[PDB]
Design a protein around this ligand. Structure first.
Ligand SMILES: Nc1n[nH]c(N)c1/N=N/c1ccc(O)cc1
Lengths: 289, 244
């Protein structure tokens, strides 16, 4: 049987599980001819009763669409199982943030957030919701370029969308309140949480059940109120004051972590925020790495 | 970008041609698969869009594979099963097998879904779906002319009538021709509008705002090819014939 357009994954040489700890079976591997490093993501088939996983189909459909400096790069799809092959990225925001030897300057934090917000602006602009914003899904290349990754829960938008979305700690009020008519603001809330995480070095809100998250959110953003959040019913700066200190950084974080999604800042306005346009200006990632 | 567009000479040396299937025969094989997809799709209550996607999958697949090694009657269900997932109108595996079975065997009776022979026809479909993905190199995003038909027929202010005939021409171009293998969707859409205009004696150049490559020389060549197969297709033209 001929197959001009699907290469055997044997073209790559497996180096290291990196890892199952990251939502699944992803390997670092090496092109056998050029040495080019890649990431191999196996398409898992346990309890796949309906042929090729509709989920693999969306992510493949989506990644094929999204071509941008701040979105992970799908190179090709390989057979033998089936593998998604990505350009390899050495670091991930979660690893870097949990490593005491790693240190970000204010100048560098600006740049990390700038790349992230730009990736989001782009994917949203393409009618895609990532739906799984979290530090461990933000990659940074050996050269200090940030890439959004793990589009396995991502989906196109334009409503009765699924409510089982976004890791608990990064999940926005809308969803925890059972909202099914949500949009790009959900990714931005996660963007808020990751930003704050750039200083606190740990996820600001670590709930245990959906309600424990909601209580926590309230102990930070004020409480969910029809005055604060029109139609909802159907201390941000003080707690971060310690770690952050910089006025501008704190303010954006306040506008990302806004309770009402329609009053929550979007990717375009955040990129515009004075935080990226005052000193120290955003700087490249060299010494962080 | 020209991966899945072929010249007329490439269409002559198709995989099927290599195993001795005549040109004419190969079209039949293609037209018959499009019918099976259209029939199954209607029964499964999927959209025309989903049916169309599956037809394009099928057309492309047979630029790589041979009818002498993969029969339309095997490929159609798999293509459709796949296209329904891709287009977000997933139909269940058993359901698609059940409907395919009734289309291909109106008088037969579904096997016991516990039998080894049925467990096997399920397994065959999954295998074939997998081969389609690899044959198409996992490129599943199809652009269809219908998007663009709507576009022209508004931007030339056609009666609902004219617009409906254009959609009809567009749908039929997929079943009856290999245009989707030769011309981009915007050109095919121009072809369908042109013939629809000719068929209704409407006169509106309009196409230059739709595709820079398009020439009247080409439009007339293509509407003629299309009108002919339409004339060869029993009862098809009756559907758009003004009987008053
Ligand atoms: N951990 C990693 N290093 N390099 C990668 N591409 C990588 N992961 N990439 C992914 C992982 C999951 C996914 O859905 C898309 C891209």
């Amino acid at each position: 049987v001929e197959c001009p357009f699907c290469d055997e994954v044997s073209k790559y040489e497996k180096l290291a599980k990196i890892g199952q700890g990251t939502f699944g079976e992803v390997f670092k591997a090496r092109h056998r001819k050029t040495g080019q490093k890649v990431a191999l993501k196996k398409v898992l088939m346990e309890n796949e009763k309906e042929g090729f996983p509709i989920t693999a189909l969306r992510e493949i459909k989506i990644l094929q669409l999204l071509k941008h400096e701040n979105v992970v790069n799908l190179i090709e799809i390989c057979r033998t199982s089936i593998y998604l092959v990505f350009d390899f990225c050495e670091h991930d925001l979660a690893g870097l943030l949990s490593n005491v030897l790693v240190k970000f300057t204010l100048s560098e934090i600006k740049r990390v957030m700038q790349m992230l917000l730009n990736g989001l602006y782009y994917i949203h602009r393409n009618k895609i919701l990532h739906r799984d914003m979290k530090a461990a899904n933000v990659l940074i290349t050996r050269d200090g370029v940030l890439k959004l990754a793990d589009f396995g829960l991502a989906r196109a938008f334009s409503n009765r969308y699924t409510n089982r979305v976004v890791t608990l700690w990064y999940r926005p009020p809308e969803l925890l309140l059972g909202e099914r008519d949500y949009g790009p603001p959900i990714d931005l809330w996660g963007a808020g949480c990751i930003m704050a995480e750039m200083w606190t070095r740990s996820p600001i809100m670590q709930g245990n059940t959906e309600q424990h998250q909601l209580a926590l959110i309230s102990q930070l953003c004020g409480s969910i109120t029809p005055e604060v959040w029109p139609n909802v019913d159907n201390k941000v700066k003080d707690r971060l004051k310690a770690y952050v200190r910089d006025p501008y950084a704190l303010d954006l974080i306040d506008k990302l972590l806004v309770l009402d999604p329609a009053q929550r800042i979007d990717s375009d306005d955040a990129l515009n925020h004075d935080f990226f346009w005052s000193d120290p200006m955003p700087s490249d990632l060299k010494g962080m790495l | 970008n020209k991966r899945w567009y072929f010249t007329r000479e490439q269409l002559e040396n198709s995989p099927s041609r290599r195993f001795g299937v005549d040109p004419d025969k190969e079209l039949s094989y293609r037209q018959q698969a499009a019918n099976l997809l259209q029939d199954m799709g209607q029964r499964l209550n999927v959209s025309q869009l989903t049916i169309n996607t599956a037809i394009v999958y099928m057309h492309r697949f047979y630029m790589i594979q041979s009818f002498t090694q993969f029969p339309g009657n095997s490929v159609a269900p798999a293509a459709l099963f796949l296209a329904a997932k891709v287009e977000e109108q997933p139909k269940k595996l058993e359901h698609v097998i059940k409907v395919a079975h009734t289309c291909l065997h109106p008088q037969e009776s579904l096997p016991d879904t516990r039998s080894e022979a049925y467990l096997q026809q399920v397994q065959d479909l999954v295998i074939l779906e997998s081969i389609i993905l690899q044959t198409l190199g996992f490129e599943l995003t199809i652009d269809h002319p219908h998007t663009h038909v709507v576009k022209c027929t508004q931007l030339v202010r056609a009666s609902k009538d004219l617009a409906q005939t254009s959609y009809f021409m567009a749908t039929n171009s997929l079943h009856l021709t290999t245009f989707s293998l030769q011309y981009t969707p915007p050109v095919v859409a121009c072809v369908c509008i042109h013939l629809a205009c000719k068929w209704s004696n409407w006169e509106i150049h309009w196409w230059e705002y739709v595709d820079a490559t398009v020439t009247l020389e080409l439009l007339d060549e293509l509407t003629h090819e299309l009108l002919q197969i339409l004339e060869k297709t029993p009862n098809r033209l009756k559907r758009i014939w003004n009987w008053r």
